[model samples]
Target: MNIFEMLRIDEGLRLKIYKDTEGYYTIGIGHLLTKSPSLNAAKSELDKAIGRNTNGVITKDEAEKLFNQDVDAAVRGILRNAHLKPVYDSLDAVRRAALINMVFQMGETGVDGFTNSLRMLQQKRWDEAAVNLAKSRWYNQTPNRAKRVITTFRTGTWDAYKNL
Candidate 1:
């Protein structure tokens, strides 16, 4: 699936402000609204996009727009990173989406810390890349989710993915 669709499924939909796992104020397909400038930008844009305060429930369509913004930022953020760029360019559509999903979950800076895994990805060492990813605390925090992305890297396919 496309990264957008993949993210929409992975993150799911939320019509109102709520606390994420870490208790950050999040809204609409995992869009953070509590911290960071980009986070602030999304809320502000939402206020403008819907032409009113976004401190309440938003339409599904409007929520999707915010999702679009965050996803685009993740895609661009990955491409612009020196280490991530080369590895991202080497992958096929499915694997690329997997990488994008990682960036979407962890911020771009967070994912950039996977030096060995990124190198593995750049070299097309699928098994090693997956192995390296599993060695991370990111994996520890969310084994099932990380495993899904790792499997994508290893098999270069999305057969391991699930919306659940």
Candidate 2:
């Protein structure tokens, strides 16, 4: 079978947000919740696209479509975010992907909270950025993930990307 069908078998089809095995809020084949967009610019867009909190329910098929749209917006948001432009243009594809992953997890507006980290990246201070990233609450919340992203930031390679 194709990968999508196989993933459906593995991830299962859920019509609601439930705690995943790790106890994170997740829904529709492992779409994990990160920080919700609180900024005014992002709020209205997400409100129109996915609703503020939750609606009643969503189908597995519909969930996939929503996920695609969200990914598209996240990519665009990352590119548009001025703070991340250096990393967007300077890093290699894998490192850029890592930064994109951060934006995906944190939302463009939410990611703006990482002023020091983004500043370090923009200033070409990779080591400092890695350190700053590791010291953040986001790192404490997800240590392994933080490590992988930091490694990519520090090393500028996919060798550290564990399925990113």
Best by lDDT: 1
Task: Tell me the TM-score of each prediction against the true structure.
Answer: 0.87, 0.65
Candidate 2 lDDT for residue 147: 82
The C-alpha lDDT values of all candidates are 0.81, 0.64
lDDT of 2 at 51: 55
Best by TM-score: 1
Ten residues in sequence with the least summed lDDT for candidate 2: 1-10
Instruction: Tell me the deviation in Å of residue 13 in model 1.
Output: 0.6
lDDT (Cα, 0-100) at 75 in candidate 1 = 90
| Candidate 1 positional error at 122, Å | 0.9
The residue-level lDDT of candidate 1 at 23 comes to 64
Q: Model 1 misses residue 50 by how many Å? A: 5.3
Residue-level lDDT of model 1, residues 55-151, one tens digit each, is: 6569888888888888889899988999899988988888999989999998988999998888888888988888889988889987877888888
